[PDB]
A paper describes a structure:
The virion is composed of a structurally distinctive capsid (called core-antigen) containing the genome and polymerase, and surrounded by a lipid envelope with embedded surface-antigen protein. Capsids are composed of a 183-residue polypeptide, the first 140 residues of which suffice for capsid assembly. The assembly domain is also unusual in that it polymerizes according to two different geometries i.e. T = 3 and T = 4 icosahedral quasi-symmetry. Accordingly, the same polypeptide chain exists in seven quasi-equivalent environments (A, B, and C in T = 3 capsids, and A, B, C, and D in T = 4 capsids).
The T = 3 and T = 4 capsids were reconstructed to essentially the same final resolution– 3.5 and 3.6 Å, respectively, and atomic models built into the resulting density maps. The structure of the T = 3 capsid described here is the first at high resolution for the apo form. The T = 3 A chain has the highest potential energy throughout the minimization process and the T = 3 C chain has the lowest with an initial potential energy 24% lower than the T = 3 A chain. The T = 3 AB dimer has the highest potential energy throughout the minimization process. The T = 3 CC dimer initially has a potential energy 42% lower than the T = 3 AB dimer and remains the lowest with continued minimization until replaced as such by the T = 4 CD dimer. The analysis was then extended to the T = 3 capsid. Here again, the CB interface was smaller, having ca. 20% less area, 19% lower free energy, and 30% less burial of V124. The same analysis performed on the three interfaces in the T = 3 capsid again identified F23, F122, and with lower confidence Y132, in all three interfaces. As with the T = 4 CB interface, V124 and R127 were not identified as important in the T = 3 CB interface. Three of the four quasi-equivalent dimers are asymmetric with respect to conformation and potential energy, however the T = 3 CC dimer is symmetrical and has the lowest potential energy while its intra-dimer interface has the least free energy of formation.
Author numbering:
A (entry chain B), D (entry chain B): 1 to 143
B (entry chain A), C (entry chain A), E (entry chain C), F (entry chain C): 1 to 142
Write the structure that this text describes.
Amino acid sequence: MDIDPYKEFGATVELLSFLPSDFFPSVRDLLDTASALYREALESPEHASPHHTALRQAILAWGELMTLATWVGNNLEDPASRDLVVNYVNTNMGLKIRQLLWFHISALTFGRETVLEYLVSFGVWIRTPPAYRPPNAPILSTL
Amino acid sequence: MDIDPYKEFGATVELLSFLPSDFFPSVRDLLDTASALYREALESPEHASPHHTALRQAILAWGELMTLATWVGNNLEDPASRDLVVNYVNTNMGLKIRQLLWFHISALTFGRETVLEYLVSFGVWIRTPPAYRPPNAPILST
Amino acid sequence: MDIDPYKEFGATVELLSFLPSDFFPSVRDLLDTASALYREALESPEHASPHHTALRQAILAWGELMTLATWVGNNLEDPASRDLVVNYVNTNMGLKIRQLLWFHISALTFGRETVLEYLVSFGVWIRTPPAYRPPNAPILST
Amino acid sequence: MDIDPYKEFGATVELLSFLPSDFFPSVRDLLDTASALYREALESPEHASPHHTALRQAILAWGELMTLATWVGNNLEDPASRDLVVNYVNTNMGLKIRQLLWFHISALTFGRETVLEYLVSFGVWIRTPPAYRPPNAPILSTL
Amino acid sequence: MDIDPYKEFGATVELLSFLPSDFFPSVRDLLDTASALYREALESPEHASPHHTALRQAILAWGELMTLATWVGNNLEDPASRDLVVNYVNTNMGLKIRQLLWFHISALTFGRETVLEYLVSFGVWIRTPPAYRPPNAPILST
Amino acid sequence: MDIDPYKEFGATVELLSFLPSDFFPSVRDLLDTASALYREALESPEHASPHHTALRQAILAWGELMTLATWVGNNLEDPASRDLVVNYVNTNMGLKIRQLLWFHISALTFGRETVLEYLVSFGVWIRTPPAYRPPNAPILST
């Protein structure tokens, strides 16, 4: 249905159908980051923060969809459909899973408040047109 | 990569490669009852329990992949391709999504511990041969 | 030689020559659910309960005799011999191993006392003739 | 599966896929020892130590496999298969059941700590080659 | 069997097979820095801090490998096997020992926590795109 | 540069290139004992005692060398260079890693001082002639 997912974390999709697309790093890189940083933290029987839980389910999903891409590569003969589907996956679903993942890693590493404020500052940066923005966009100061 | 998805819920995927596949319901009725029961708790700005949060993320992914199937059927030409893809969606990954949903929903409306006991009891039910089987497997109620 | 195997579990082999043979499940699903439920407690350096310990030793013997059957099928020539042996394994001694497993596993997930009550209730169920029998024998849940 | 059985008693299979084969006494002798020493101790409704319990289940198993050997003797016509199976039983399964049994009797009689330390000392003895080992290998001093 | 040489220093091989390999500089510079900066501490027979001790054993092992390469060059004249050997050495063991030396030296000089948070920050930097990364990458502070 | 990996544990390579090499047994038995006896401590991410840590790094290095031998056997077909390589490995690095593993394991199990005085006693034993040595050589006591 029409649920707002981040509503319990203060954000909203309109606050993140707002950023550009290139900002979020590549998906493989997100997964490697999350795993290498929080391997034993995520494998543990503890819901120490819900960020971990949503992150965990999202990673399950992305594993399932990489399985989808591989499987479709294994069986579908129509090459246009194969290429089109794989591109749609890695592009649009890619964008959404990147939103989700990057958000949760950021909340973990720097705190939900810091990311919330960073997004507001980025928004004020990007609503501004080229003629008056700074050359560089803001950055996550952890304190 | 090495994720144990259900580790923070006192359960394990070993314990759900342990039910069968066909037991789980359709996604449609399941999603509908989830909505009708927890509209507010899902829309709220509150992490009332982690169950709600994992559920939110699952609904996101499911809606996005419904949009995927629809977009794919909007553009491709090979109908065999479209049918095969939308089967892989509604059948194979659907099993995963249904596992995840059914677990979290039942845990919400009943509790974690009751679900664990139910899974163990279904284990005792299904490992049993047919002849001395009960007539009706358990249907959980609070 | 005169061992009463289940004497330290408030039960007796008389009370399990009292169920039938066919009630017990396959070794495969049973072992699988055991693993999926008690991976850690079996791997741990802890005798959390004697049930775990007897279970460990049973899994050892079962794995070793699977290796036995495989080795025997690796070398012999007479296929009648191989089939007869691997039947004696998966059928006759399998019954013993399944008794032992099912008892300890069910006692783990539920408790000793619940298992005792279940056995007595199955006794009352099966000694009863078919006509006034219940439709479904008991399926234990916590 | 890949369980480590002795992990709750401090040992490990690598610590006992380490000894030689001749060391463990004959199986019939193990059973006679265990029975004559702890007949009423094992028949009792007491799990006074888990050693007793694992010992009890192991003896059940060996009874079942002696029944296997006898039964195969009763029915199998192919003599090579009969001899081969009986030898495999009394040899490899023999070795493993001897490991288990001797361990548990030792833990009972002398305490798990003493056997643990004895195994370490035996290991230090046997890793040493012939040129520098003592002529005799160590022995279970109960104190 | 499950030997992870970073388990007790707050990390794992995955966290170090997370950066690109090219960041970890060539072994010669590492050894030179180690010697020039801790001649005394590595010559000292005191188990001051375990980082030093791992570093000791690591340097001994690398010296052993260089001795091996020497023995090969001075005894095996054949070029194909020799070259493949030296490539395997300077590539795979090169990678591992570079990782190890960099981590331990950095932890000694600066500190454990600082190295870990540096890895995390460098990760999220290099994964992050160029148009919105910080202008200059992070770097270790005394 | 003057790297002596025993400097902080009360010894030196000379004191271990003092016994005959044949006393230090083959690597397989060492690794098996280490695993079977300290699976947990070597899997634990805690710098409990530096002996453990040196042992960790040493096992990683030996595994790396075995991986090297594997890579050579799976890529270099020439037998002369390959055989000379494996001989150098299983001889020289074999010696050093045997020395190291024996010392550290023994020190863990029994204690530092006991290993040192054992070396001293074994030395003065084997150097001493047969007609007036003790009847049986010394041996480590718990």
